[PDB]
mmCIF file of C-alpha atoms (C1' of nucleotides) in Angstrom:
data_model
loop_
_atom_site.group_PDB
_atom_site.id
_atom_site.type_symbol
_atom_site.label_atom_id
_atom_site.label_comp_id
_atom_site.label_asym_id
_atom_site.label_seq_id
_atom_site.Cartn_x
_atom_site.Cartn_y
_atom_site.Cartn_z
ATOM 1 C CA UNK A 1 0.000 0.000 0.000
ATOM 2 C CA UNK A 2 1.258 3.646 -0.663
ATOM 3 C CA UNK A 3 1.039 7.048 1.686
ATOM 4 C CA UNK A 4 0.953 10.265 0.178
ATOM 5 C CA UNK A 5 3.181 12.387 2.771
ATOM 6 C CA UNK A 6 2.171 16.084 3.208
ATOM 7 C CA UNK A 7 0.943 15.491 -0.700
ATOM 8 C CA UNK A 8 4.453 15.915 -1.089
ATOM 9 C CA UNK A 9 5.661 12.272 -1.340
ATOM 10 C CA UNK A 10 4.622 9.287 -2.474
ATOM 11 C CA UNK A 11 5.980 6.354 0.178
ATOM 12 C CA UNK A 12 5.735 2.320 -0.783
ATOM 13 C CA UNK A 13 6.909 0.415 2.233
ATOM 14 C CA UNK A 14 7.042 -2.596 0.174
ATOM 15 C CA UNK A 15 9.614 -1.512 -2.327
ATOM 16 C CA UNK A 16 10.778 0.958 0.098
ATOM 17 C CA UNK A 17 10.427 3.796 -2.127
ATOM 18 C CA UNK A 18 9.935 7.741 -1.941
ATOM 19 C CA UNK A 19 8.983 10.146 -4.766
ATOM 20 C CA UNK A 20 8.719 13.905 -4.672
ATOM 21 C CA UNK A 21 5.703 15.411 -6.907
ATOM 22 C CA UNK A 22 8.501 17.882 -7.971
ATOM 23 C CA UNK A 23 9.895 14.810 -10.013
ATOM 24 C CA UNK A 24 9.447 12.518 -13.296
ATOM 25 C CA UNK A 25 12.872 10.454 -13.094
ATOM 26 C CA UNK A 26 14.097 10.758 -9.706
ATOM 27 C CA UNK A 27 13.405 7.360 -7.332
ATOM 28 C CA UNK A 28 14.765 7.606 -3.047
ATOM 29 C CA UNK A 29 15.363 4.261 -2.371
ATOM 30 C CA UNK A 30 15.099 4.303 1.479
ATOM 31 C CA UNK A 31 17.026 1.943 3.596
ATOM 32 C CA UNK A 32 15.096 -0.551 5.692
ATOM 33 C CA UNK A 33 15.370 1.625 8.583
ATOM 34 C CA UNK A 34 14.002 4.295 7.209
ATOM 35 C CA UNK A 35 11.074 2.927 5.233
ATOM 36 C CA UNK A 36 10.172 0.515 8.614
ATOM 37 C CA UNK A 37 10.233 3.758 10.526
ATOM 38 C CA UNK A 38 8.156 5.936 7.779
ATOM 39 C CA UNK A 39 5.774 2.847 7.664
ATOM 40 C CA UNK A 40 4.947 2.670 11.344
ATOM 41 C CA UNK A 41 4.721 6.442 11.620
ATOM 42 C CA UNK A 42 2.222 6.149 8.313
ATOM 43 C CA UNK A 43 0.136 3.456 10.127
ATOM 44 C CA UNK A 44 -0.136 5.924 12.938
ATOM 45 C CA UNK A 45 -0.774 9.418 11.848
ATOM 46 C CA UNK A 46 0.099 11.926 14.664
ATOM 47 C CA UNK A 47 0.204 9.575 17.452
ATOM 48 C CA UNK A 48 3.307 9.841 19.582
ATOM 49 C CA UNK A 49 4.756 6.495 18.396
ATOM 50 C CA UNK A 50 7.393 5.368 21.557
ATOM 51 C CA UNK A 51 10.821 4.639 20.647
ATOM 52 C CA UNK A 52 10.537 0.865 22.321
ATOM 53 C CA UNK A 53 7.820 0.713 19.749
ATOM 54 C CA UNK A 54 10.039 2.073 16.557
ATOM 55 C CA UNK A 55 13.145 -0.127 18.179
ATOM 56 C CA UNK A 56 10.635 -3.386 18.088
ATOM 57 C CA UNK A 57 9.307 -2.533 14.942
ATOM 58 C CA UNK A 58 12.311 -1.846 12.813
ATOM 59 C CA UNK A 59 14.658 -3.821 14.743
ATOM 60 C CA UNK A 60 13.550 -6.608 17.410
ATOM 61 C CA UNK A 61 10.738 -7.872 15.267
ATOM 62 C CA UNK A 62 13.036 -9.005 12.748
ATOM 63 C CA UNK A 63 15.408 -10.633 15.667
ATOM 64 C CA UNK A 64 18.316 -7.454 14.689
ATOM 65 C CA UNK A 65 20.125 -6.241 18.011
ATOM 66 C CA UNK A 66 21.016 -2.582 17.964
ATOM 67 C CA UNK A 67 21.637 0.270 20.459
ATOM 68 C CA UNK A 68 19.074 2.737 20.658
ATOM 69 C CA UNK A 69 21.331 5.156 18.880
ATOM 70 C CA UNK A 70 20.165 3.347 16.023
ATOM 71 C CA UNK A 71 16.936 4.819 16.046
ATOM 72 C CA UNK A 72 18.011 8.131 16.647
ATOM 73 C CA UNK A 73 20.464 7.813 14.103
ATOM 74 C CA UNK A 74 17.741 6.485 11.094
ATOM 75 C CA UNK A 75 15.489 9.433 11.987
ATOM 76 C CA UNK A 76 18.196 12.191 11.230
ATOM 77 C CA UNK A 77 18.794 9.852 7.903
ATOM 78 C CA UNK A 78 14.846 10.089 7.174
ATOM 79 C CA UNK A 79 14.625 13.444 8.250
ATOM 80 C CA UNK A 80 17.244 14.290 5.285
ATOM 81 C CA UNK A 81 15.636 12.566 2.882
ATOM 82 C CA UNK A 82 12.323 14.020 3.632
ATOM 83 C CA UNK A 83 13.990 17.372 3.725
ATOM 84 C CA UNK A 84 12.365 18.017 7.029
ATOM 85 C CA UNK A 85 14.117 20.336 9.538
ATOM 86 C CA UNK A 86 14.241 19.365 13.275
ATOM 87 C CA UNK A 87 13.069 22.413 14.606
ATOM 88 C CA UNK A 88 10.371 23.334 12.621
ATOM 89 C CA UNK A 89 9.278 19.776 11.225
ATOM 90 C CA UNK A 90 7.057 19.630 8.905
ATOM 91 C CA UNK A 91 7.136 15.778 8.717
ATOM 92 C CA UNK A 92 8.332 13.920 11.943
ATOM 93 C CA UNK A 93 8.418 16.158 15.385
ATOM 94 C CA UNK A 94 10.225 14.707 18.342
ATOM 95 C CA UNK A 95 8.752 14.385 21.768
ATOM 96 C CA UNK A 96 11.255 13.971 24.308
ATOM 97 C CA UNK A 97 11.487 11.252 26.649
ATOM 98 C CA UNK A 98 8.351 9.473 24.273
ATOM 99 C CA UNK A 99 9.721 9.368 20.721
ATOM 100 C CA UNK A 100 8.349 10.823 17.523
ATOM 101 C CA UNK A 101 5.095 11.748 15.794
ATOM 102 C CA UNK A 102 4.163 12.174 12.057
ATOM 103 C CA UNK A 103 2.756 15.784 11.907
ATOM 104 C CA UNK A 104 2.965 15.338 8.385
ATOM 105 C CA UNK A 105 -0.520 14.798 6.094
ATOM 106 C CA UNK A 106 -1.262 11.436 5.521
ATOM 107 C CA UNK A 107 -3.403 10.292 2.298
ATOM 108 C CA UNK A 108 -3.842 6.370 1.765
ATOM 109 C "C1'" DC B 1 9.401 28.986 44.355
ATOM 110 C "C1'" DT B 2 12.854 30.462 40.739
ATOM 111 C "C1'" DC B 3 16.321 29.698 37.833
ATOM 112 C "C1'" DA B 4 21.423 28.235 37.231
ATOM 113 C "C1'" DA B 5 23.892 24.229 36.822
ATOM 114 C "C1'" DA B 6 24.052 19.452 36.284
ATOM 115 C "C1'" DA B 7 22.362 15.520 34.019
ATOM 116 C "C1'" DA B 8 19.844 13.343 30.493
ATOM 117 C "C1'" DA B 9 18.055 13.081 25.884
ATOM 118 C "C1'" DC B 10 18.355 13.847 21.135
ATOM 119 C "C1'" DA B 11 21.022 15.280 16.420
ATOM 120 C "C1'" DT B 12 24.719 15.294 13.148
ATOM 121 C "C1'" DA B 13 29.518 14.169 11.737
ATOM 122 C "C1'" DA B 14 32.892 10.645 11.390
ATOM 123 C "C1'" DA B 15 34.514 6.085 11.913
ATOM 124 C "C1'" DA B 16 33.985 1.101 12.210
ATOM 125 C "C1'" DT B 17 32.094 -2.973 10.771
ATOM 126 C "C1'" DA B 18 30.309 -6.528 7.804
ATOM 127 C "C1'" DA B 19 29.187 -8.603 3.641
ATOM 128 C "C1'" DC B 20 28.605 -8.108 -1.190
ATOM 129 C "C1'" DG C 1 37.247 -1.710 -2.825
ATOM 130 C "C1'" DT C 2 32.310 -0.198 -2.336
ATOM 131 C "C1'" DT C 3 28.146 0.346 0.120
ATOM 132 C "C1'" DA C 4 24.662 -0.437 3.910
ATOM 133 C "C1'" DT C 5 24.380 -0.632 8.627
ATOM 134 C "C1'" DT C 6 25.887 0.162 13.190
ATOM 135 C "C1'" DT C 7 28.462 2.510 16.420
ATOM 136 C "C1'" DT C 8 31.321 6.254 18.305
ATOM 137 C "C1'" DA C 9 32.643 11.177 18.879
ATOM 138 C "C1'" DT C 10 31.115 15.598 19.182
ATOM 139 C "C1'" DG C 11 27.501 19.011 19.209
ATOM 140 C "C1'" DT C 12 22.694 20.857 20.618
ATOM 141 C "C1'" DT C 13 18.486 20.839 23.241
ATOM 142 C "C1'" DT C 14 15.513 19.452 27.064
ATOM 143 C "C1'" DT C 15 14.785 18.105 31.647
ATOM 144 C "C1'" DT C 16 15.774 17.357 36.369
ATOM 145 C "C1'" DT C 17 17.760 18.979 40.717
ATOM 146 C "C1'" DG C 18 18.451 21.889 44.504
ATOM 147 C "C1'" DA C 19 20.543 26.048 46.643
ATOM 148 C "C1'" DG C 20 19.517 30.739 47.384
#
DNA sequence: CTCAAAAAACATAAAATAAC
DNA sequence: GTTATTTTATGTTTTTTGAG
């Protein structure tokens, strides 16, 4: 299934792609991180998603072992890609001490 | 009963690691 | 000998603590 992000991007979790409207040839091929993150965010539109909850679902799920600097590390990667700015987001805000929320539009 | 300083939490820049 | 992923080093912001 694709999101429509902000009606900026188009997002496929399943062949972990994101497209910007702006473009015809141009294809961001997300790591797994980053499209696992974007997908649970996309599931949950402006909930305050818990970083146990992004480290399960990206990570432990899948029986990988990381540090939570992993997580922290993939949203600055996804933030980059998605252009957003960490203070003012317009895609993925952080909430200290919870984890992170899509502020972004979602479209399905 | 506040607000500075200390500690914790989060972000980005580099480096290390692993496996094509 | 190159690239994705993880981790480490350094920087920035937020929160907790407690003395005045």
């Amino acid at each position: 299934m694709k999101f429509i992000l902000a009606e900026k991007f188009t997002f496929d979790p399943l062949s972990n792609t994101l497209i910007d409207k702006e473009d015809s040839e141009e294809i961001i091929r997300l790591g797994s991180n980053e499209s696992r993150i974007l997908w649970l965010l996309a599931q949950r539109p402006n909930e305050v998603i818990s970083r146990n909850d992004l480290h399960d679902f990206v990570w432990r799920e899948q029986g990988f072992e990381v540090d939570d600097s992993s997580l922290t590390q993939a949203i600055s990667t996804l933030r980059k890609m998605l252009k957003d700015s960490t203070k003012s987001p317009q895609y993925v805000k952080t909430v200290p001490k919870r984890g992170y929320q899509l502020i972004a539009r979602v479209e399905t």
